[PDB]
């Protein structure tokens, strides 16, 4: 019933997410956006800032004011990462909790049926009066 260890797996998939999409976003954010005018060792770091840290949400929303017609899916990058994570993580948690519940209750009913085992072998073998 040990189904917890699927936890760190999501965080290392998060490593995958941040690598891929911070690299793409850091190319398109190093190209023209003047907030940093380039991010190689601080791409992870800038996206992680924008993730409701250092009060920097609208902070990133300004360099996309300097390119609005073709740069919005970067704040939507925040959105995408959040959604993908929350989805898989949350649903795994749900399934694990509910397996535990169902097995617990149904097993208790069946061990009452083992009490019925007790009843039976007390009935026949233990009260024969001739052996």
- Would you say 35 and 60 are in contact if contact means Cβ atoms under 8 Å apart? yes
CB of 32 to a copy of itself, least distance (A): 11
* Binding characters for ligand CCCCCCCCCCCC, 49-88, by CB under 6 A (x = yes): ------------------------x---------------
Instruction: Please identify, using beta-carbon distances, which residue of 16 and 124 lies nearer to ligand CCCCCCCCCCCC.
Output: 16
23 forms part of the interface with ligand CCCCCCCCCCCC (CB under 6 A) = yes
Q: Is 51 in the site for a copy of itself (CB under 8 A)?
A: no
The alpha carbon of residue 70 and the mean position of all alpha carbons in its chain are separated, in whole angstroms, by 30
Under rule CB under 8 A, residue 112 binds a copy of itself:
yes
Whether 81 contacts 17, CB under 8 Å: yes
- With vertex at residue 22, the alpha carbon angle to CA 18 and CA 26, rounded to the nearest 5 degrees, is 165
- The verdict on 98 binding ligand CCCCCCCCCCCC (CB under 6 A) reads no
**Dihedral of the alpha carbons of 118, 121, 123, 129, in degrees to the nearest 10:** -140
Going from the C-alpha of 109 to that of each of 97, 101, 123, 128, the distances in angstroms are 19, 13, 21, 30
15 lies in the site for ligand CCCCCCCCCCCC, by CB under 6 A: no
Neighbours of 21 (CB within 10 A): 18
Residues 91-110 that bind a copy of itself (CB under 8 A): 91-92, 94-96, 98-99, 101-103, 105-107, 109-110
54 marked as binding residue: no
């Amino acid at each position: 019933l040990r189904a917890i260890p699927g936890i760190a797996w999501i965080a290392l998939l998060l490593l995958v997410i941040f690598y891929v999409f911070a690299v793409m976003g850091t190319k398109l954010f190093a190209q023209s956006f003047p907030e940093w005018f380039g991010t190689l060792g601080a791409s992870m770091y800038t996206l992680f800032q924008v993730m409701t840290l250092e009060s920097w949400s609208m902070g990133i929303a300004r360099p996309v004011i300097e390119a609005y017609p073709w740069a919005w899916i970067y704040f939507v990058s925040f959105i995408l990462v959040s959604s993908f994570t929350v989805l898989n993580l949350f649903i795994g948690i749900i399934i694990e909790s509910m397996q535990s519940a169902h097995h617990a209750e149904d097993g208790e009913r069946t061990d009452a049926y083992r009490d019925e085992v007790l009843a039976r072998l007390e009935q026949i073998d233990q009260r024969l009066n001739a052996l």
